[PDB]
Amino acid sequence: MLLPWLILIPFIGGFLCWQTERFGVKVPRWIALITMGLTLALSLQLWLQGGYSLTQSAGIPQWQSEFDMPWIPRFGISIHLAIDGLSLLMVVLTGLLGVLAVLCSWKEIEKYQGFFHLNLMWILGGVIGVFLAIDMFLFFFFWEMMLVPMYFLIALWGHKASDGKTRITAATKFFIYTQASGLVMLIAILALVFVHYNATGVWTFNYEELLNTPMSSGVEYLLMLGFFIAFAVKMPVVPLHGWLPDAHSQAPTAGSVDLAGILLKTAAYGLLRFSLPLFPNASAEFAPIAMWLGVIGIFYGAWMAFAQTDIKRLIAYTSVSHMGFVLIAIYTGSQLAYQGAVIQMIAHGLSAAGLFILCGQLYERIHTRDMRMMGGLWSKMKWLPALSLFFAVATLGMPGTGNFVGEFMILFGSFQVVPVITVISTFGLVFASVYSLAMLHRAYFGKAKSQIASQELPGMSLRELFMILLLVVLLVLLGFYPQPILDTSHSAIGNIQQWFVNSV
Amino acid sequence: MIPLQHGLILAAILFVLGLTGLVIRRNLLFMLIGLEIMINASALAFVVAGSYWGQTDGQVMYILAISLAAAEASIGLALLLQLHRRRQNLNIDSVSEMRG
Amino acid sequence: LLKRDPLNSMMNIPAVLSRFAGKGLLLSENGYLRWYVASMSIGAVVVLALLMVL
Amino acid sequence: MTITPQNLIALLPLLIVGLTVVVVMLSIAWRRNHFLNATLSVIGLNAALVSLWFVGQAGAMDVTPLMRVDGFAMLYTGLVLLASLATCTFAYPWLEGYNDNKDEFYLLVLIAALGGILLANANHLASLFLGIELISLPLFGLVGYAFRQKRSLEASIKYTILSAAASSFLLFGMALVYAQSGDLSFVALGKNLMLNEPLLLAGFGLMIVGLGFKLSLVPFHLWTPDVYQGAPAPVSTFLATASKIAIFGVVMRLFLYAPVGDSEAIRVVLAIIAFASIIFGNLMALSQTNIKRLLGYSSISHLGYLLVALIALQTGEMSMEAVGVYLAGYLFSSLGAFGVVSLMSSPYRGPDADSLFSYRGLFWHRPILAAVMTVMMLSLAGIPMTLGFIGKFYVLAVGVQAHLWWLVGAVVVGSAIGLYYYLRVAVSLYLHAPPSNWQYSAGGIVVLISALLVLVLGVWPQPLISIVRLAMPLM
Ligand SMILES: CCCCCCCCCCCCCCCCCC(=O)OC[C@H](COP(=O)(O)OCCN)OC(=O)CCCCCCCCCCCCCCCCC
């Protein structure tokens, strides 16, 4: 009953951000902050009232909250939202990253800031809708709906240093990748709906009805392949990853579009929620290919991140490697590795948010993202290189940060299932330490390699310092006390794992 | 005792002859003449089919066909007049400046 | 070796094939009316032959 | 059989459009009055549109062997009447700059609308032929209305010659079909058959040549960018919406009613044509700097998607409502796009504004037109929250239900290519570039209403689904 408002408050807030722009040019940021704080507070209230710690695994479906409303009754399509532990964690993460995105673009006093804030809130509402929708058509609708404001933000509000054509090209590549993969997923959804309609005789796009769908081996594999192609584009899984570094490099320079658009892992959630329960046998036969795609993603992303001369491109390829770890975790059928995947999703969101916000502030300071021009910046800045050192320390899987908890619980469960893939992935963790040290030494240590880095740079403001230190505190608390997060998602992960291993 | 296939084959021969004349002629007047041959061949085919079945519908379709032929020749002659007035030539290859 | 992102180029191959095929297909739109009539006749021959063989 | 008074009641939009043709022409003969004759034409079209209610109250029945009036005919008559009304509304501010006589435009639009209504009600080979020419010939006049320009005269000559060739092809195919069957009614085309008689198949092939010319289907498609660019922009609006919609409706009715619609060879030929149409139309629009040519190649691709929905007509039961929903969405999106083009070309001053450099940066002087045009580019791309996506979703569902996997993959690939060029146009609207009359405001209101309808029925499509499912023909 609060889930429709969880989606609607961002949309109404974006509309009010556009409308209240005429009242003043400093008004839309306040409106976006109020509605993002309201969405975060509603998700936190759902967390407090859900009682997820004392929830046992009763089998799929098991929702802590559920809303249903008829939308297109001809096809049996409904606005069907449902929240449980995993979805709740993703929604709270989306709200926190949305508040961070609003605070990140606070100093934008441009003439059309209301449209920027409307696009931001529409992206955030679409992401929350992806995390909440259990009607398959509604899930696909939110999935493809959140890409239009993403496209326009990248194309029109993006990186000022690049020319217009490069931003248009990056936005077009991102849109083509995501929407073509989404259309393949829509083909799979439609074919599953028609298989169920031939088996029973009724139209349904409901997740719970489509779970009990008898399919032949081979049809189920093809539906699984369509779902996985969509999720692999948005994860990213190699080779469907090329859109991501150009989308990050041409995103708006503050970083809010990286936080709102990319750093929320809807594809790993979709693999856990849909690909594994709807097609458990096909996922069981796809597990070796998906595991080796994850291994290649880890190592390819590490090598790409090391070879970047752009710091934002480096952070994008770090995201590719970490999602390779999560992809290995998802296809393993182990509760421990699934819980590690949840922790890794949250921790990667927090650490990549910190890295991208710090990179945006650094670009504001020195007006270049090329690491061949910045050097020895530890002596020039007051706070930024130390916090960047902390976040690069987190991204290599440092104990005391949640990244270590996620990565190592993934590796423990995966070794219990697949040992060879696990040992190769731990050597991938060595590769992660390599690229993090390389970024740190090329940026902030050594001697100045140009003239802009040779002079004193202004200190970080109280708002930037506050949001970065909040991310630091959250990552440290996740590293040292991950038990509330593990208890929140324990029942949902248990249901998904039991469904996956009881049907194979 | 005329076979229906013989009348249909004669109409097809006249149709492909008119189509060939439409393709191979650069003058717009000869293209309009080939179009007239084409529509008259199709109308002849309808007449043959109506005569085989003993129905008036063949000649009714013939009447509609030549009504279209008359109005099409009228419009084509107006357009040929405009082409001659605005180009001083009836070469149909000259009116080709829209492409790509 | 990998700093060029070879997998990204491998996945950019279909876009290049799309440009090439579109530029090749645009050659048929030369603007000539007699060629348009000839293409209609060619399509008629193709459609009729396909209907005859099946 | 004769014409009953009830049959006259079912004949109401045809009678009203013919009567207003006669009235507008007599008013022209009395005195040339652009405002009065435009008003009389739109009054007649609105009267036919509201007489559709009485036609619905009458019921579904046969008017002569030539016509059959059912809910399907109601839906397509309403579609072509909306297209004609929008064309007249766009035509007035364009014709305000026309130095020659402007009153004949509305006469030709009305006669073409009459042909569209006849094609909506057509149940006969005679009716189909007559409706095709009744649409085509006034469009020969309308495409070359500004014959003082190079491009309009070129497009008129191309359209006239090629449409005469297509009419000859269609008539010869009709004659071969009649020679095989002995009846020109739709239901009897294959009743005496073993359904793959060579003469019946060849006749339907030549009819396919003519009809695929009219629908810009590959390989009878090469005229489309030339005639779309050359024609006046309200004429391009009418030619993109009403002609395509009416001819595809009569093609749907013919393939639903004729027993040779179930033949495998015709289905394979149509599948090849649909595949090539989708792929070729999307590929050729990739590198187009002219908005009219781009919309022509777009129309080729969208008619390919509709053809995919028509191929599965005998297999499933969702194909006809898929075509109805798709045609409603495509009508509204094409009305918005071509109407923004027309309003940017109004008043007439010679060469219209069709280069993409003209629309580059449109938001900084025409923000509402830019918003409408970007909504239409999103809708023609089949992006969710637009009605074009609902049509694409219907096409994909129909193709999946019939196991037409080659066509489904073609729709996906063509959609990605379309995404490229549509998003290029939509984002070029918002870059940085280097009227004052109530009829122009009426055209702006028309494109704005089309944009709002596209958005609202993309978000909430169920009223359109119910309306299209109500518009069911006689089985
Ligand atoms: C896991 C693999 C198997 C499953 C694949 C499923 C498909 C969906 C998920 C993968 C999507 C891959 C998309 C690849 C192309 C991505 C878009 C791109 O690279 O665009 C480049 C370019 C835009 O750049 P721009 O600078 O504007 O152009 C220069 C001026 N013309 O664009 C252009 O210039 C024109 C682009 C037109 C559209 C691109 C062509 C798409 C054709 C369909 C491909 C489907 C997949 C084929 C098999 C996989 C690849 C081998």
Ligand SMILES: CCCCCCCCCCCCCCCCCC(=O)OC[C@H](COP(=O)(O)OCCN)OC(=O)CCCCCCCCCCCCCCCCC
């Ligand atoms: C300034 C002046 C302005 C003037 C107004 C202009 C704008 C408004 C236009 C109004 C047009 C009204 C048309 C009404 C059509 C339906 C009439 C009706 O009563 O239909 C009911 C009938 C079934 O009911 P019943 O009559 O009981 O039949 C039993 C057996 N005969 O139903 C049927 O048999 C089928 C009915 C549906 C056929 C399609 C609907 C008509 C065409 C609509 C085209 C546009 C559709 C797309 C847009 C939808 C937007 C929501």
